[PDB]
Homo-oligomer: A and B are copies of this chain.
Amino acid sequence: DEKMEVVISFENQLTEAESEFKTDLGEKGEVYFKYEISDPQKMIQLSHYYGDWGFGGGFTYTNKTDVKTPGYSNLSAITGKGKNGKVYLTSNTNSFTPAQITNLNTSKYNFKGAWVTNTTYDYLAIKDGNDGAGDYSIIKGPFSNKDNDWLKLTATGYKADGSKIGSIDFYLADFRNNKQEIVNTWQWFDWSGIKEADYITFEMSSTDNNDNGQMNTPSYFCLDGITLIEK
């Protein structure tokens, strides 16, 4: 009668410290190769993209602990560790590499949610105005109350036929109303609003955009402890 939770884990799936998942099994698109990671329990699929700069986007799993190095070469969470353990997910989500989670048994399980935090990459960009790009900077500067700055992660749920259920937002940073919030801990992102989703896509948006409306803030985030619930 009481409905069981299943926590997705990549714990003990990396054989080396300070490492990430890599594959050469993708299919080549425009820029990147595309692959689908299945978790060890075959509960979910995660989109995975790679290319000329290493990890491209979608998701990879990592145990990296680097909380100091700016720029895209660092895939670490600002926490320096997972919520449940050593191994967590890093994502880059955009029109080239859309980050997608697919439920492999949607008739049996619903989505509950996941723990979320910032990448070190995003944290240092927002806090210090240091995106690591060097002499050239792509970002406008650090986030401020002056500009009412914010960074939003949006999860959109879909049915198996492609019908949109809904969107739900999580603020990774927020300088509205004299707050100075930059997420640097694991925080629960509840997905009960899209629990019936066959798949979930991720989009990011901020107050730091170019003249073509494209976000300058890195479109990266971290997840851990993705939780499903028996229906």
Contacts and interface: CB of A to CB of B under 8 A. Distances in A.
Interface of A: 28-30, 47, 95-96, 100, 102, 106-107, 158-162, 198-199, 212-214
B161 A107 contact: yes
A100 B162 contact: yes
A159 B106 CA distance: 11
19 contacts: A28-B212, A28-B213, A28-B214, A30-B96, A47-B162, A100-B161, A100-B162, A102-B162, A106-B162, A107-B161, A158-B160, A158-B161, A160-B162, A160-B198, A160-B199, A161-B198, A161-B199, A162-B198, A162-B199
Contact of A29 (B28, B95, B102): B95
A161 B102 contact: yes
Nearest to A159: B160
Contacts of A198: 160-162
Given A158-B161, A160-B160, A160-B161, 12 more contacts: A28-B213, A28-B214, A100-B161, A100-B162, A102-B161, A102-B162, A158-B160, A159-B160, A160-B162, A160-B199, A161-B198, A162-B199
Contact of A30 (B95, B102, B158): B95
A211 to B, nearest CB: 10
Contacts of A212: 28
A207 to B, nearest CB: 19
A28 to B, nearest CB: 5
Contacts of A47: 162
A96 B159 CA distance: 19
A162 B213 CA distance: 27
B106 A161 contact: yes
Contacts of A162: 47, 100, 102, 106, 160, 198-199
